[PDB]
Ligand SMILES: *[C@@H]1O[C@H](CO)[C@@H](O[C@@H]2O[C@H](CO)[C@@H](O)[C@H](O)[C@H]2NC(C)=O)[C@H](O)[C@H]1NC(C)=O
């Protein structure tokens with residue numbers, strides 16, 4: 073799904089990945105130490121899986 | 123030998139039958155295969171797919 077649309081869904085930074093979750097309908101794939109920092113500074117995002 | 127022509131070898135000999143074997147090979151096995159959903163379907167991508 074991602075290699076078909078590398079222009080569309082893949083981003084350049086963590087910051088541009090969070091802004092597309094906040095605005096668009098998107099499921100950005102971070103690393104678990106910067107999901108814990110985002111979900112304290114912004115209480116409207118969450119960590120889905122394990 | 124002849125400087126205009128080159129080596130006109132009269133090689134063309136029989137003293138012993140041919141060295142090992144001849145070549146039977148790959149043949150690439152062409153497959154008659156239509157496109158149809160999820161058996162055989164095209165890929166969509168950004169860069170050209172050939
Ligand atoms: C409440 O639900 C709405 C819609 O389901 C969401 O807010 C908007 O979601 C759309 C996605 O279709 C975005 O384009 C908008 O930018 C969102 N609005 C804002 C202000 O960002 C969201 O799920 C919830 N909105 C909240 C909690 O404010």
Ligand SMILES: *[C@@H]1O[C@H](CO)[C@@H](O)[C@H](O)[C@H]1NC(C)=O
Nearest residue numbers: 094095112113114115116117
């Ligand atoms: C999450 O987004 C909403 C609306 O976009 C806004 O209240 C704020 O940016 C966030 N919520 C909280 C509690 O910080």
Ligand SMILES: *[C@@H]1O[C@H](CO)[C@@H](O)[C@H](O)[C@H]1NC(C)=O
Nearest residue numbers: 124127128129130131132133
């Ligand atoms: C090579 O020699 C043979 C022997 O008769 C001749 O027939 C032929 O014309 C010559 N030249 C080439 C290019 O084969």
